[PDB]
Amino acid sequence: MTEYKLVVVGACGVGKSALTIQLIQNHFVDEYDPTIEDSYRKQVVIDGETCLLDILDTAGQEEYSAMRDQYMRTGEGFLCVFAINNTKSFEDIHHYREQIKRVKDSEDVPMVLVGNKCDLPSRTVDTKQAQDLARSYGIPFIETSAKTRQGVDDAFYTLVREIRKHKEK
């Protein structure tokens, strides 16, 4: 069956693990070690296609930089996550965008921008600012809450749709 290799990236504490576990196991985890990097696999149906998602929940630095380059080269699409109450995590998106393009040596890499924690009242990044960034990249932007599940399926399924558009060229 068709397999999609997805990679979830972003600053520590933005909800990469909480998003991934909500997608896979349909519950919200309040505490999950920030240093754990692991992969998950789930069979889903997206637009009538039965497919397997192979999702890498990243944790930042690797023992050797070759491990980072390896997962960036093999990953087919990237979910770039910031938290709407953490401006530094939004600014870090620039770094992930650049680094992924640099390792893949491609200007066209399937990506979706995710503003997570949208259930919280505290917000430092308004929606307009994130829409402006996504527009400059030419990629979709989705606001999510790993806690309420709002937007979670849309974020991952949209990324699959971006991969499919990239492959048909």
Ligand X SMILES: Nc1nc2c(ncn2[C@@H]2O[C@H](COP(=O)(O)OP(=O)(O)O)[C@@H](O)[C@H]2O)c(=O)[nH]1
**DSSP structural state of residue 32:** -
Q: Name the binder of 40 from ligand X, Mg ion, none, CB < 5-8 A by kind.
A: none
- CB atoms inside a 10 Å sphere around CB 38: 12
Site string for ligand X, 87-116 (x = CB under 6 A): -----------------------------x
Q: Does the protein bind ligand X through residue 6 (CB under 6 A)? A: no
Site string for ligand X, 27-66 (x = CB under 6 A): ---x-x-x--------------------------------
Taking CB under 5 A as the criterion, the residue among 8, 11, 17, 160 binding Mg ion is: 17
CA geometry: angle 58, 60, 63, nearest 5 deg:
105
Taking CB under 6 A as the criterion, the residue among 72, 147, 159, 160 binding ligand X is: 147
Cα–Cα distance, 88 to 149 (Å, whole number): 24
Smaller CB distance to ligand X: residue 34 or 167? 34
Taking CB under 6 A as the criterion, the residue among 18, 93, 112, 163 binding ligand X is: 18
- Closest among 53, 42, 49, 50 to 4, alpha carbons compared: 53
Taking CB under 6 A as the criterion, the residue among 16, 75, 93, 100 binding ligand X is: 16
Per-residue b/e over 3-30, b at no fewer than 16 CB within 10 Å? ebbbbbbbbeebbbbbbbbbbeeeeeee
Q: Does the protein bind Mg ion through residue 158 (CB under 5 A)? A: no
Q: Does the protein bind ligand X through residue 154 (CB under 6 A)? A: no
* Residue linked to tokens 């990506």: 111
Q: Which residues contact 38 (CB under 8 A, 6 or more apart)?
A: 56, 57
Contacts with ligand X, residue ranges (CB under 6 A): 12-18, 30, 32, 34, 116-117, 119-120, 145-147
